Amino acid sequence: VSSMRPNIFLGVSEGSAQYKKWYYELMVDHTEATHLRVGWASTEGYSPYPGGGEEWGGNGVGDDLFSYGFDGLHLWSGCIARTVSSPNQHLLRTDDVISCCLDLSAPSISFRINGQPVQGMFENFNIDGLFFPVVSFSAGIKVRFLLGGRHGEFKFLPPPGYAACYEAVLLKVEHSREYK
Ligand SMILES: [Cl-]
């Protein structure tokens, strides 16, 4: 299991914050046991290093208390699966488009699948740190972030009040993979 993320970091501050609600999509270009989870993680989940260093771990989305993932059937956090429902329900597969929503004002993390709402969302979790889009996947799986911006246009309209993640570009994708 590998992971990818863009360099987009969203969070609370004491400055101007016209947008507290953030949206992106993931397109699944190819799927062939397997793993494919998408959602968000916080920098509070970084691994500590000597001298105060903190590093992204690149682990499975929802396999700790700092990340929040959807796989088509379940929501994941803290290594535990919650069952959710949707129309036409399936584990993620080729040509699925997953919408990911982060509402820092609620707080909530919620999803759509091929434009339809997933019934069940994350609530009652902390919003310490900065949040980033993130996906994790087993071998051979091909996915793309659609962040907004001319090279990653959305397939669906963001919900009212939501901003494209591309607007928070202060754009690169990082991929973490096992070495061995
Ligand atoms: Cl890979």
Numbering used by the authors: 652 to 683, 690 to 827, 832 to 841
From the paper:
Ryanodine receptors (RyRs) form ∼2.2 MDa calcium release channels located in the membrane of the sarcoplasmic and endoplasmic reticulum. Triggered by either cytosolic or luminal Ca2+, or by conformational changes in the skeletal muscle dihydropyridine receptor, these proteins govern several Ca2+-dependent processes, including the contraction of skeletal and cardiac muscle. RyRs contain three different SPRY domains, named after ‘SPlA kinase and Ryanodine Receptor' where they were first discovered. RyRs bind many accessory proteins and small molecules that affect their gating properties allosterically.
